[PDB]
Amino acid sequence: RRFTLWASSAPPLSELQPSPHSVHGIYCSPADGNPILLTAGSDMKIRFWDLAYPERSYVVAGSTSSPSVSYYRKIIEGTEVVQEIQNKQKVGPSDDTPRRGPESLPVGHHDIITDVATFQTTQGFIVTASRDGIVKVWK
């Protein structure tokens, strides 16, 4: 594991993941300017991570509370650990918020992104297919 990326507030891998943190779609490109796109199933959202600039990796999809991410990579010898310092992410291993479900999404409510993919008929644009037999398209 030359790299290890964690949504955790702590730099080591504290097992703070709800089940959906481990269950997600992902899309990567061996070409085309080296973009990567990543579902965070804990937060039900599309992060971006650019092989060109991990520090400047502006996510493509929003958050209702506080979206901005100080994505700074630290090191503890053995892995170049990426501290995704999302400003006020509001997630942990238990239900310390009254509801926190389908109402908490960048416009287009849904189940977790089963599949996400990019297509380019004119401009580049992207599809998110949810577990719910439902799809939303972004441009």
């Binding site: 490109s29 300017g33 973009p35 060109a52 502006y58 493509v60 960048p106 939303k136 972004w138 441009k139």
Partner: peptide
Amino acid sequence: PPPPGWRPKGLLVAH
């Protein structure tokens, strides 16, 4: 294949 795609924000166009 598309151009480099880090530049665009995505706005939800369809459902």
